[PDB]
């Protein structure tokens, strides 16, 4: 039902078609087993020609006729066999594929629209809950999974029956109890293989979980890189837990891996067992009773049936997932909650004009338990009036304003617009009649002309003009290139928040409702802009009854009536003066405020060599692999022999022949395999281990010893990075295992296939090889056309998706809701294109697939016919055809490889290339010399010469152009400028995180450019904006193991002492052993920073780098900070850059630098004596 039905819902001819194609499928599966019967009949007559050709010591002419008659006889049987099965195949396959698509196609598309629009209709709820980025995510993700649900399904049916009727058909109709001996031994052994192999395949997955755990405990926090460099390099830790848990779950998962190799060994062991019981039980049931040397037909066939069962399984799986996640989220789809709002008909209010009425409205947010912010609210506003609301505590003001848009619904009481109940009037009509301007001026990724269009569909640039002109925007818009026809560059991040809001107005203004609300929309914006804005508001208000919420009591003045609020508390209402004269709330407050990487440069064999390096040696590996190749050919021939001697040879010892070859095949494959595998498993496996481990190490280090523009200015987050760790270590592991499997299959197939290709008959040799490369090339072009169509498809659907996103994501549309559908409409457009495009491709796959099959029966019919060719009186055409099985299934061997084992070597290579280039690096500052920390460098006079720099992004114009400063010893070097850059960049330069473009610095003598980077970073005391510390124990944080700097207890104590954080150190559970607790999410920036300080001073710098240290704080925190900073400074050189135009006075040398160049400098009252720059700073400061 719902689950499956609803899943498979919608489709007149869709459904019908569906069934049809399905039928085709069935016939298809059945097609291959009947195919096996043919194997029979032809091979049977072949056998008879083998015993009459094996007699040979008698009539020569009777052999001419008898054997030739048999030739053209089966030659006819051949034509008709492949012809039938074949053409059929081509046809049926084509049909079904059409099923998959067409069906699922139309289906999806439908589900498409319905989901878009549904979402669009869940109202507030999609705000209420949801993660809304998550919502659309599943839009795309889930829909797709459903589609794949319908198509793979078709697949499942196909094979489901291939094995059902196959195993039946042959597995009964041809044996009557022999087909059964099959049934017995065959179905049985199949059970054992599937069984043990799955038990440890699952054991394998348990290995993948314990594995992911070792990995994270091998991940750790690697962000805060900066602070990190101003610290040195963890580098032991990472390695410690890294190789630790790795090595462990390595050998171990590599044990279960060698166990999956003990699995491939099991399966091949068991399979070998297949041969045992197979050939044995036959040998008997083919020597004694039922003598046809054909039984193999049945046995072999049904076996194939068990395999259909398997392939059947993954398809099913797909049906499941698609089904599942699809129907359950489809439930979150089709579902029509709605009702708390809607968008369909209603009560039409054409009376125009009216007054807002809030009569006893109690309300609680959707989050059930939350406290009813609107504990019975009574408020009513006349028309044409400008009524404001005042608040500050948060929640209620908005909440209410909100309700007025019938956004959520009242928990009790009612709201009457004009004189009717809002909940009565139509929603759209309502929402329309309601012009609102929240604060966030959300704009679209289109032309302005458009955003306004959105305001109201039909409309001429005429009106628009007027609107924008009444929304006072007609100007800047004109000065703006391209005019109204100008776009908003990818989202609304191109113009000034102000203008934006303005436009919104215009927009809403075009709406021209009769009710207006301003959710602080002036709020969060500079002054001047603010005033112009409010201006617009007014010109838009007073012609329309309005209500506003704002902390700008000023613009609140001209309030026709103020409402007393503060976090949900309805009190004093009335004109300004009345509340002021009310010495209460209004009055009160009035007086209180006064992940895309992807890189071209690959590496041909470059990875292999690096590969070989990271590889100690394991000829053993390649070796055993090789022999494994030799093994496949072995089996193939072993069979060719078996069937051979049996169908054409001497009557006595047919038993020892069978019993042997059979046992042979057994011991051979089985034993040789289990061993070849297991052993290789352990070897190559280890390779993967050390490689991954060692690899990570080197790499990560490369990062450690890496820096400069990298992390200082990264476009490579801590995630893409860590990921690099995991994913890429695994991938190189890939390059190795592959090279291994490569040589294997090769020599395997090539080497042996060819030696056999020699014992061949020159027929097959050429013909067949022609067939393998051919069919192979088909499989490759197939995969290519399939992924190509999949990629471009994701492209068109991407465009449609993104837009969809913009909408949903930006629900602030339902704000005006005059688009909902309109939106969805546009999508239908986009969607229409990739839809017709879908049908086309549908067909494609069809033909493609069907052609695969074509080459299938094709190549085997022409191959077998040509084989049998000339068998008149006993020519060079006999049992060797099995040797044909050899070369052919060897092609099937190559496919066993490019289809199994290691990754397709593609992404393995990418990730390899990446991880390499990275580990390569180009250090940039590591061991060195460039001095000797001579016992006379303890000065500090930092000297800045030329100072011309700009971090990698030079086309952004150097943020340091021709600069030069200086700071004596043991004093205070004040620093002030415009904002953001300049200050920091300077501190950094000292840290020499980026050697300037031209210039240099003298710590006190030698040249920092040419000074021992390390040491230069030994004596430094940076305390920047956002403080940070790993999740160690604070005693550990403090005792910042800079270098040899052993965790000196009385030393770190000394740190908490001067760092002023000893107040906490004293008590606070444990005392000095208190970890940062949860990574450091249990303290105030004042405490952290203090430790930051504790850091600095515990290092005993000779230079203090204060980068606007305390920018976000308060009270005794900024106080005890300026104190510890006061006692931690003056005893040594210290640059104090900041935005503390307040405690910037007490500075030995205040330097006003103007981004790029220095502008003023000197003692405070002197800089003040030079009125203008520094002056205008103390003045704007006020
Ligand atoms: C994709 C399908 C062909 C699929 N193979 C694999 O999933 C696979 C995974 Se590793 C692997 N095959 C390796 C490699 C060497 C292919 N094969 C062997 O060790 C081996 C030993 Se005897 C034998 N194969 C015969 C022969 C008829 C080959 N194969 C089958 O009865 C058969 C039935 Se379904 C199937 N194969």
XYZ file of C-alpha atoms in Angstrom, residues 218-867:
650
model
C 43.434 9.751 14.533
C 41.875 13.068 13.390
C 41.911 15.536 16.272
C 41.661 19.380 16.046
C 43.943 20.820 13.369
C 42.358 24.224 12.963
C 43.572 27.305 14.820
C 46.575 26.714 12.578
C 47.702 30.324 12.990
C 48.064 30.335 16.754
C 49.644 26.982 16.025
C 52.502 28.484 14.005
C 53.009 31.147 16.630
C 53.597 27.971 18.647
C 55.662 25.639 16.426
C 54.453 22.107 15.782
C 52.517 19.470 17.740
C 53.729 16.737 15.432
C 54.261 13.910 17.912
C 50.640 13.714 19.069
C 49.050 13.601 15.645
C 51.488 10.850 14.750
C 50.974 9.051 18.044
C 47.222 8.511 17.904
C 47.444 8.554 14.128
C 49.626 5.460 13.490
C 48.443 4.024 16.834
C 44.742 3.386 16.175
C 45.613 3.083 12.478
C 48.256 0.363 12.765
C 45.840 -1.428 15.128
C 42.592 -1.396 13.094
C 44.957 -1.730 10.133
C 46.473 -5.187 10.661
C 43.108 -6.051 12.137
C 40.821 -4.785 9.358
C 43.634 -6.192 7.249
C 42.982 -9.483 9.035
C 39.304 -9.359 8.151
C 40.588 -7.965 4.838
C 42.822 -10.982 4.551
C 39.582 -12.576 5.751
C 37.723 -11.099 2.740
C 40.714 -12.472 0.930
C 39.918 -15.497 3.113
C 36.450 -14.803 1.682
C 37.476 -14.546 -1.953
C 39.326 -17.710 -0.863
C 36.193 -19.068 0.755
C 34.036 -18.301 -2.302
C 36.720 -19.711 -4.622
C 37.276 -22.555 -2.165
C 33.559 -23.289 -1.946
C 33.336 -22.648 -5.652
C 36.103 -25.189 -6.099
C 33.823 -27.364 -3.950
C 31.213 -26.607 -6.581
C 33.531 -28.353 -9.034
C 33.932 -31.307 -6.708
C 30.290 -32.198 -6.175
C 29.576 -30.862 -9.699
C 31.918 -33.143 -11.674
C 31.811 -35.997 -9.184
C 28.042 -36.433 -8.954
C 28.027 -35.997 -12.730
C 30.901 -38.364 -13.492
C 28.690 -41.029 -11.890
C 25.238 -39.872 -13.169
C 26.847 -39.579 -16.586
C 28.834 -42.797 -16.750
C 26.295 -45.139 -15.207
C 22.784 -43.826 -15.837
C 21.835 -40.739 -17.953
C 24.825 -40.835 -20.303
C 24.813 -37.539 -22.339
C 28.008 -35.727 -21.445
C 25.356 -33.034 -21.526
C 24.208 -32.991 -17.936
C 26.587 -30.063 -17.557
C 23.904 -28.211 -19.517
C 21.547 -28.407 -16.576
C 23.987 -28.298 -13.707
C 26.009 -25.429 -15.173
C 22.745 -23.606 -16.045
C 20.937 -23.646 -12.679
C 24.208 -22.638 -11.118
C 23.976 -19.519 -13.220
C 20.549 -19.282 -11.654
C 21.952 -18.863 -8.180
C 23.934 -15.974 -9.593
C 20.856 -14.291 -11.023
C 19.617 -14.469 -7.443
C 22.623 -12.405 -6.418
C 22.460 -9.597 -8.993
C 18.790 -9.714 -8.182
C 19.751 -8.755 -4.615
C 21.492 -5.519 -5.317
C 18.700 -4.385 -7.603
C 16.187 -5.157 -4.849
C 18.273 -3.230 -2.382
C 17.884 -0.229 -4.679
C 14.139 -0.765 -4.810
C 14.117 -0.836 -1.025
C 16.052 2.374 -0.335
C 14.351 4.294 -3.108
C 11.082 2.903 -1.823
C 11.828 3.585 1.804
C 13.439 6.994 2.090
C 11.295 7.962 -0.940
C 7.874 6.988 0.408
C 8.586 8.204 4.012
C 9.874 11.577 2.795
C 7.270 11.272 0.059
C 4.890 11.243 3.008
C 6.555 14.489 4.094
C 5.813 15.382 0.417
C 2.349 14.376 -0.835
C 1.156 15.163 2.657
C -1.065 18.231 2.741
C -0.870 19.436 6.339
C -1.609 23.058 5.482
C -4.767 24.386 7.271
C -2.905 26.706 9.588
C -2.811 28.893 6.530
C -3.154 27.868 2.764
C -3.289 29.850 -0.543
C -6.765 28.847 -1.996
C -10.007 30.898 -1.984
C -11.343 32.180 1.374
C -13.240 35.313 2.452
C -12.800 38.256 0.010
C -12.710 41.681 1.714
C -13.410 44.419 -0.899
C -14.463 47.043 1.640
C -10.924 48.352 1.500
C -10.051 50.448 4.567
C -10.142 49.258 8.167
C -8.541 49.160 11.614
C -6.331 46.587 13.236
C -7.869 44.912 16.261
C -5.994 42.800 18.814
C -8.505 41.427 21.297
C -7.054 39.264 24.111
C -4.527 37.310 22.081
C -2.553 34.658 23.915
C 0.261 33.022 21.975
C 3.152 30.635 22.249
C 5.701 29.911 19.473
C 5.381 26.586 17.549
C 7.964 25.073 19.862
C 5.096 23.746 22.046
C 6.589 24.169 25.557
C 7.990 27.680 24.978
C 6.297 30.337 27.136
C 3.250 32.068 25.595
C 4.930 35.338 24.698
C 1.536 36.897 24.083
C -0.051 36.438 27.512
C -3.369 37.996 26.454
C -2.650 41.068 24.410
C -5.115 43.904 23.985
C -4.295 46.561 21.415
C -6.227 48.160 18.585
C -5.022 50.701 16.042
C -7.106 53.181 14.089
C -6.618 53.743 10.376
C -4.201 56.235 8.822
C -2.320 56.237 12.128
C 1.348 55.561 12.695
C 1.458 53.331 15.811
C 4.770 52.107 17.051
C 5.925 49.455 19.439
C 8.839 49.679 21.775
C 10.745 46.838 23.294
C 14.258 45.497 23.848
C 14.165 42.283 25.966
C 13.353 40.357 22.788
C 10.175 38.590 21.561
C 6.574 39.774 21.571
C 6.873 42.943 19.556
C 7.890 41.026 16.442
C 5.776 38.008 17.371
C 2.726 40.239 17.382
C 3.603 42.271 14.261
C 3.987 38.853 12.805
C 0.560 37.530 13.688
C -0.819 40.537 11.863
C 0.276 38.800 8.645
C -1.677 35.802 9.794
C 1.775 34.237 9.684
C 1.382 31.897 12.665
C -2.016 31.669 14.219
C -3.227 32.869 17.629
C -3.107 30.424 20.547
C -6.211 32.237 21.956
C -8.219 35.409 21.439
C -8.502 37.000 18.012
C -7.287 39.686 15.694
C -9.671 41.742 13.637
C -8.464 43.568 10.534
C -10.702 46.419 9.434
C -13.612 45.042 11.398
C -13.644 41.338 10.435
C -11.485 38.476 11.740
C -8.182 38.138 9.871
C -8.469 34.358 10.153
C -11.618 34.778 8.066
C -10.432 36.857 5.093
C -8.544 35.154 2.273
C -4.821 34.613 2.846
C -3.352 35.849 -0.433
C -5.743 38.796 -0.616
C -4.753 39.345 3.040
C -1.028 39.041 2.693
C -1.312 41.360 -0.335
C -3.305 43.974 1.534
C -0.418 43.722 3.969
C 2.776 45.489 2.938
C 5.636 44.558 5.188
C 9.252 45.466 5.488
C 11.252 43.257 7.734
C 14.807 44.449 8.494
C 16.713 42.050 6.274
C 16.331 43.606 2.844
C 16.353 40.281 1.028
C 16.981 40.831 -2.690
C 17.080 38.379 -5.529
C 19.565 37.116 -8.066
C 17.947 39.076 -10.874
C 17.417 42.587 -12.105
C 15.930 45.236 -9.883
C 13.291 45.630 -12.556
C 12.584 42.103 -11.480
C 12.668 42.224 -7.683
C 9.933 44.848 -8.102
C 8.187 42.653 -10.668
C 8.141 40.111 -7.808
C 6.508 42.775 -5.713
C 3.637 42.516 -8.135
C 3.508 40.552 -11.384
C 1.916 42.800 -14.017
C 3.284 46.333 -13.943
C 4.970 48.772 -16.303
C 8.379 50.246 -15.674
C 6.150 53.362 -15.525
C 4.592 52.431 -12.243
C 7.894 50.907 -11.166
C 9.645 54.146 -11.940
C 7.146 56.069 -9.881
C 7.504 53.483 -7.115
C 11.267 53.482 -6.988
C 10.924 57.240 -7.376
C 8.580 57.352 -4.394
C 10.823 54.901 -2.628
C 13.445 57.499 -3.443
C 15.757 55.201 -5.340
C 15.351 56.599 -8.820
C 18.757 58.202 -8.341
C 21.464 55.696 -7.374
C 19.638 53.260 -9.649
C 20.250 55.646 -12.529
C 23.893 56.260 -11.531
C 24.079 52.500 -11.446
C 25.224 51.150 -14.824
C 22.631 49.256 -16.882
C 19.795 51.005 -15.035
C 16.674 49.275 -13.719
C 17.913 46.450 -15.887
C 20.800 45.926 -13.492
C 21.328 42.614 -11.749
C 22.150 41.738 -8.132
C 25.381 39.696 -8.584
C 24.723 36.166 -7.295
C 22.289 36.693 -4.410
C 21.923 40.109 -2.711
C 25.599 40.940 -2.080
C 26.525 43.823 -4.412
C 24.891 47.021 -3.205
C 24.574 48.815 0.128
C 22.281 47.342 2.719
C 20.614 50.701 2.672
C 19.663 50.865 -0.962
C 18.608 47.260 -0.661
C 16.079 47.982 2.046
C 15.013 50.922 -0.070
C 14.274 48.743 -3.033
C 12.325 46.394 -0.744
C 10.203 49.395 0.019
C 9.688 50.195 -3.603
C 8.800 46.535 -3.966
C 6.333 46.410 -1.146
C 5.418 49.934 -2.251
C 4.341 48.622 -5.643
C 2.257 46.258 -3.570
C 0.622 49.423 -2.171
C -1.415 47.665 0.555
C -3.346 49.620 3.171
C -1.627 48.107 6.151
C 2.077 48.522 6.722
C 4.533 47.040 9.145
C 8.165 47.803 9.748
C 10.055 45.156 11.654
C 12.763 47.599 12.610
C 13.827 47.739 8.965
C 15.842 50.890 9.675
C 17.635 48.976 12.438
C 21.011 47.448 11.589
C 22.256 50.287 9.363
C 24.569 53.329 9.564
C 23.200 56.736 10.551
C 22.926 58.983 7.477
C 21.552 56.039 5.474
C 19.083 55.435 8.324
C 17.715 58.976 8.082
C 17.225 58.820 4.315
C 15.514 55.467 4.848
C 13.066 56.690 7.498
C 12.344 59.471 5.052
C 11.229 56.898 2.504
C 9.167 55.111 5.130
C 7.149 58.229 5.946
C 6.538 59.126 2.295
C 5.117 55.592 2.143
C 3.374 55.670 5.478
C 0.723 58.137 6.506
C -1.254 57.369 3.388
C -1.508 53.935 4.928
C -2.348 52.861 8.494
C 0.861 51.564 9.930
C 2.655 49.999 12.790
C 6.364 49.906 13.423
C 8.714 48.360 15.891
C 11.970 50.135 16.592
C 14.629 51.095 19.137
C 15.152 54.437 17.420
C 12.832 56.128 19.900
C 13.631 59.177 17.777
C 11.819 57.980 14.660
C 9.360 56.680 17.272
C 8.607 60.248 18.352
C 6.255 61.100 15.528
C 4.309 58.126 16.874
C 0.555 58.519 16.730
C 0.647 56.097 19.665
C 3.364 54.152 21.405
C 2.934 50.636 22.727
C 4.811 49.612 25.846
C 6.725 46.399 25.362
C 9.987 44.719 26.505
C 10.254 40.962 25.960
C 6.504 40.421 26.149
C 4.882 42.881 28.563
C 1.906 44.983 27.287
C 1.726 48.187 29.398
C 1.551 51.930 28.713
C 0.124 53.202 25.432
C -0.520 56.648 24.043
C 1.295 59.696 22.741
C 4.970 60.258 23.453
C 4.451 62.928 26.064
C 1.805 60.780 27.837
C 4.239 57.905 28.396
C 7.118 60.311 29.205
C 4.828 62.054 31.646
C 4.081 58.479 32.743
C 7.622 58.083 34.150
C 7.336 54.388 33.365
C 8.511 52.004 30.621
C 8.614 54.103 27.461
C 9.878 57.078 29.360
C 12.323 54.780 31.189
C 13.975 53.169 28.166
C 14.005 56.538 26.334
C 16.143 57.833 29.158
C 18.247 54.630 29.310
C 19.452 55.035 25.718
C 19.605 58.849 26.278
C 34.367 22.382 -0.814
C 35.734 22.450 -4.370
C 39.312 21.393 -5.017
C 39.685 19.567 -8.344
C 43.127 20.207 -9.918
C 44.356 19.491 -13.508
C 48.085 18.553 -13.146
C 47.954 14.760 -12.735
C 50.964 12.425 -12.771
C 51.744 9.614 -15.213
C 53.691 6.814 -13.528
C 54.943 9.612 -11.287
C 52.557 8.201 -8.711
C 53.858 4.724 -9.467
C 57.401 5.666 -8.695
C 56.390 7.564 -5.554
C 54.253 4.498 -5.107
C 57.326 2.223 -5.316
C 59.167 4.420 -2.862
C 56.450 4.243 -0.142
C 56.703 0.581 -0.889
C 59.546 -1.246 0.818
C 59.242 -4.436 -1.382
C 56.894 -7.333 -1.949
C 57.941 -9.308 -4.927
C 56.128 -11.911 -2.885
C 53.090 -9.842 -3.633
C 53.427 -9.542 -7.377
C 54.632 -13.131 -7.458
C 51.676 -14.861 -5.866
C 49.543 -12.557 -7.947
C 51.119 -13.822 -11.117
C 50.570 -17.440 -10.198
C 46.960 -16.532 -9.478
C 46.734 -15.480 -13.096
C 48.165 -18.823 -14.044
C 45.484 -20.301 -11.844
C 42.548 -18.811 -13.769
C 43.889 -20.157 -16.996
C 44.393 -23.435 -15.137
C 40.744 -23.852 -14.202
C 39.535 -22.887 -17.655
C 41.660 -25.601 -19.205
C 40.962 -28.064 -16.400
C 37.341 -27.816 -17.447
C 38.133 -28.021 -21.201
C 39.944 -31.239 -20.366
C 37.207 -32.737 -18.202
C 34.308 -32.221 -20.539
C 36.745 -33.188 -23.241
C 37.904 -36.660 -22.234
C 34.374 -37.387 -21.197
C 32.616 -36.444 -24.448
C 35.296 -37.808 -26.781
C 37.727 -40.581 -25.882
C 38.094 -44.140 -24.591
C 35.195 -45.928 -22.709
C 37.249 -47.536 -19.936
C 38.680 -45.326 -17.233
C 36.078 -42.690 -18.002
C 35.701 -42.977 -14.190
C 39.337 -42.339 -13.251
C 39.445 -39.602 -15.904
C 36.491 -37.796 -14.299
C 37.320 -38.601 -10.664
C 40.757 -37.197 -11.439
C 40.202 -34.025 -13.418
C 37.425 -33.383 -10.933
C 39.627 -33.833 -7.877
C 42.246 -32.013 -9.900
C 40.027 -28.987 -10.555
C 39.256 -29.181 -6.889
C 42.641 -29.312 -5.208
C 43.949 -27.082 -7.932
C 41.643 -24.030 -7.885
C 40.561 -24.325 -4.286
C 43.876 -24.926 -2.589
C 46.029 -22.893 -4.920
C 43.526 -20.055 -4.615
C 42.882 -19.930 -0.868
C 46.644 -19.781 -0.646
C 47.412 -17.472 -3.516
C 44.822 -15.067 -2.145
C 45.330 -15.247 1.672
C 49.050 -14.923 1.235
C 48.784 -11.970 -1.163
C 46.156 -10.553 1.175
C 48.588 -10.388 4.070
C 51.427 -8.989 1.917
C 49.892 -6.334 -0.302
C 47.652 -5.595 2.643
C 50.596 -4.611 4.814
C 51.667 -2.434 1.920
C 48.382 -0.566 2.218
C 49.001 -0.240 5.903
C 52.469 1.239 6.154
C 51.697 3.274 3.039
C 48.583 4.849 4.563
C 50.297 5.345 7.949
C 53.718 6.550 6.857
C 51.969 8.538 4.141
C 49.706 10.479 6.524
C 52.643 11.168 8.786
C 54.861 12.645 6.062
C 51.958 14.580 4.631
C 50.538 16.081 7.807
C 54.130 17.053 8.688
C 54.507 18.673 5.302
C 51.566 20.727 6.473
C 53.143 21.445 9.820
C 56.371 22.616 8.151
C 54.027 24.251 5.637
C 52.470 27.686 6.068
C 52.649 31.257 4.722
C 49.899 32.010 2.177
C 48.566 28.475 2.724
C 46.619 28.730 6.002
C 47.443 32.441 6.573
C 45.243 32.918 3.500
C 43.674 29.560 2.800
C 40.963 28.550 0.366
C 41.539 25.135 2.024
C 39.588 24.674 5.243
C 40.347 22.370 8.166
C 37.829 19.932 6.652
C 39.067 19.700 3.067
C 42.418 19.303 4.829
C 41.736 16.545 7.387
C 39.789 14.861 4.602
C 42.891 15.060 2.481
C 44.460 13.043 5.307
C 41.987 10.185 5.458
C 40.652 9.869 1.912
C 44.023 10.345 0.138
C 46.066 8.050 2.330
C 43.473 5.380 1.472
C 43.684 6.272 -2.231
C 47.460 5.808 -2.594
C 46.892 2.483 -0.854
C 44.839 2.206 -3.992
C 47.579 2.948 -6.549
C 49.575 0.082 -4.999
C 46.970 -2.668 -4.760
C 46.036 -1.852 -8.361
C 49.464 -2.003 -9.941
C 49.383 -5.362 -8.190
C 46.030 -6.520 -9.598
C 47.137 -5.070 -12.911
C 50.194 -7.240 -13.528
C 48.022 -10.078 -12.243
C 45.127 -10.041 -14.690
C 47.557 -9.201 -17.459
C 50.037 -12.046 -17.336
C 47.091 -14.055 -16.087
C 44.956 -13.536 -19.194
C 47.601 -12.392 -21.629
C 50.421 -14.798 -20.718
C 48.329 -17.905 -20.252
C 45.487 -16.958 -22.572
C 48.151 -16.719 -25.262
C 50.169 -19.887 -24.491
C 46.804 -21.541 -24.799
C 46.118 -19.328 -27.811
C 49.075 -21.227 -29.284
C 47.868 -24.785 -28.412
C 44.842 -23.191 -30.052
C 43.918 -23.705 -33.663
C 44.499 -20.263 -35.146
C 40.755 -19.992 -35.710
C 39.657 -18.891 -32.288
C 42.939 -17.176 -31.536
C 42.284 -14.436 -34.084
C 38.456 -14.484 -34.285
C 38.022 -14.467 -30.538
C 40.648 -11.833 -29.730
C 38.793 -9.736 -32.283
C 35.639 -10.393 -30.261
C 37.120 -9.576 -26.834
C 38.613 -6.178 -27.719
C 35.361 -5.463 -29.549
C 32.852 -6.354 -26.820
C 35.185 -4.739 -24.288
C 35.295 -1.461 -26.173
C 31.525 -1.576 -26.158
C 31.387 -1.869 -22.348
C 33.694 1.112 -22.065
C 31.839 3.374 -24.490
C 28.713 2.295 -22.647
C 29.910 3.426 -19.241
C 31.067 6.681 -20.915
C 27.715 7.540 -22.537
C 25.946 6.603 -19.281
C 28.021 8.917 -17.027
C 28.122 11.631 -19.683
C 24.312 11.750 -19.774
C 24.299 11.503 -15.968
C 26.647 14.510 -15.641
C 25.048 16.952 -18.097
C 21.716 15.844 -16.654
C 22.873 16.901 -13.172
C 23.773 20.211 -14.853
C 20.385 21.224 -16.221
C 18.737 19.872 -13.067
C 21.351 21.855 -11.111
C 20.197 25.158 -12.561
C 16.570 24.310 -11.840
C 17.597 23.160 -8.376
C 19.559 26.290 -7.428
C 16.675 28.546 -8.302
C 14.339 26.284 -6.318
C 16.823 26.739 -3.548
C 16.913 30.512 -3.652
C 13.154 30.406 -3.180
C 12.660 27.849 -0.474
C 15.802 28.895 1.381
C 14.440 32.425 1.173
C 10.904 31.816 2.400
C 10.830 35.649 2.862
C 8.834 35.438 -0.301
C 5.701 33.993 1.221
C 6.279 37.336 2.774
C 4.363 38.684 -0.210
C 3.430 35.226 -1.494
C 2.586 36.823 -4.828
C 4.928 34.329 -6.511
C 4.652 30.890 -4.902
C 3.301 29.222 -8.000
C 4.749 31.839 -10.350
C 8.010 30.498 -8.934
C 7.159 26.873 -9.340
C 6.043 27.855 -12.819
C 9.499 29.023 -13.813
C 10.782 25.676 -12.489
C 8.339 23.797 -14.577
C 10.080 25.602 -17.442
C 13.544 24.572 -16.476
C 12.095 21.163 -15.632
C 10.311 20.889 -18.970
C 13.651 21.095 -20.760
C 15.387 18.364 -18.871
C 12.134 16.414 -19.166
C 11.885 16.075 -22.925
C 15.644 15.641 -22.580
C 14.840 12.716 -20.229
C 12.681 10.878 -22.771
C 15.431 11.253 -25.353
C 18.047 9.799 -23.039
C 15.557 7.139 -21.988
C 15.619 5.838 -25.509
C 19.405 6.155 -25.524
C 20.129 3.819 -22.652
C 17.672 1.560 -24.358
C 19.526 1.191 -27.610
C 22.889 1.234 -25.822
C 22.016 -1.653 -23.541
C 20.290 -3.709 -26.232
C 23.426 -3.337 -28.377
C 25.486 -4.766 -25.542
C 23.385 -7.882 -25.638
C 23.588 -7.882 -29.419
C 27.314 -8.153 -29.368
C 26.651 -10.888 -26.803
C 24.699 -13.636 -28.580
C 26.258 -12.307 -31.825
C 29.881 -12.941 -30.985
C 29.063 -16.351 -29.443
C 27.054 -17.593 -32.399
C 29.523 -16.553 -35.051
C 32.265 -17.820 -32.719
C 30.728 -21.255 -32.194
C 29.601 -21.688 -35.796
C 32.997 -20.814 -37.246
C 34.475 -23.147 -34.677
